[PDB]
Subunit: 150 residues, 4 copies
């Protein structure tokens, strides 16, 4: 049914982004019931958000970069089951994990993930997702380092 | 150099989104010069934006859905070289193309693309991109229709 | 429940191989899962590959005459798609069955073949291989139109 | 300028085949570009494929003993990676060269092999095949750790 429709939409966006070299794609599907509206609105984006002049410094100050510094700033996963209801900071569930380096020198990046979903609804990130993300950034860290030293 | 670094970042985000079933991913790379800031911030997302109750009707009214209705509402590509400087509507370059149906029955969707880029900078969408997008949505339209009738 | 964990795994294996290929720049990836039931064997061997088969500059005239390029040849000269249900059972071209759908890629003006798209073994959710149907044929006919444009922009 | 349009094309061809595979659910895609220089031949044949090779339930014990599963076997029993520069030139395992990097996938606790990752033909920008180096080996060693977790979550 619509699960199949929601899968094509993903494919179409990823494909168009690949072939055209655009940052954003949105697929609007005319709602069959209300022709004025959209039954599905599938969105995707890819972007390098900083090509500036530390102007990048001041961008870190911003409220959506919060959790990133919090994790760079702890060396430890941050896990927020429902963000609307959360009381440590002034879009729903969020996992965010330090990308560390080769021989645990220090921290070289952060993975934020937003809205784990159900294979369904939006969901919290569990200890098992954490463990998976932790194993994932190991190779990432090692890939990121190669693209400079070489 | 950083072009290679900007490519890994894309791969990492697409991969993490694939494996974890999240909507948003952001890869922060600690700026080597200012440890407080981010040298790169690579962002990606995938989302179904409407699972509601036409509540979807009122969502069409919104200012970022503008151009979508404009194209549903014309049957013709819309092409805006620099949006900040544009005078037809109250993020920069934008192409937006109707997804039509099998035997040109009517319109079943819209592709918005934002920010063509250079293989470099952000760029306008040309007549050639249009022609390419026009040929692209033909198979899309035919794929979208299959996931309902079947 | 136990066929539900196996379709799962295939998905992961494909993701794995696609991910590693993309990151590593290799032509071929094969992931073997050791059979839990006895450790001397593999319960899954998931293969994926990616490569350009014509790295030679003529010497291609000879290669084009290979047995495995016949469908391609047939579609190119004929200028129309070819649909075979079971490549073995077929009589004009000299168990587990194989299905084939081969479609021409044309120039905008549709009077000349500029390439060909050959697809093998349409699949069902972990289902068997099946024949390509008319929607399949319809769909690919629409798909190669934008392929032609892509390709042509590239040969500038 | 004219080798610049050819690396371009390979990129498009890979994108095409990946796109069509993904949309169509087929195991194999081959895109042929008709040689502009003479229409009887193909100047590019870009192949990509995707499939599970063990669809049988024992009968796998026999399959695991195939010649093309030896590296896999060797890595699994040995429990450590295997790196071959030119699979032909190599003497323990019974031109255009082939390079091979095969790494074990382990359980969290690292005392048992649960699968194996075999990579073939590391490539250079349209460059030739080359040997896998130590970074290659380092990188894959880090990559399979998360593979193990993925796989295991799947076998619940």
């Amino acid at each position: 049914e619509t699960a199949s429709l929601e899968v094509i939409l993903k494919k179409i966006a990823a494909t168009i982004i690949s072939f055209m070299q655009v940052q954003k794609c949105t697929i609007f599907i005319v709602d069959e019931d209300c022709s004025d509206s959209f039954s599905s609105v599938f969105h995707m984006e890819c972007e390098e958000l900083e090509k500036s002049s530390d102007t990048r410094e001041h961008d870190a100050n911003k409220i959506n970069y919060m959790y990133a510094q919090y994790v760079k700033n702890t060396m430890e996963p941050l896990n927020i089951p429902d963000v609307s209801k959360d009381k440590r900071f002034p879009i729903r569930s969020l996992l965010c994990t330090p990308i560390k380096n080769g021989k645990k020198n220090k921290v070289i990046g952060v993975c934020q993930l937003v809205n784990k979903m159900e294979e369904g609804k939006v969901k919290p990130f569990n200890r098992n997702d954490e463990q998976f993300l932790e194993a994932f950034v190991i190779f990432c860290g090692l890939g990121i380092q190669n693209t400079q030293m070489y």
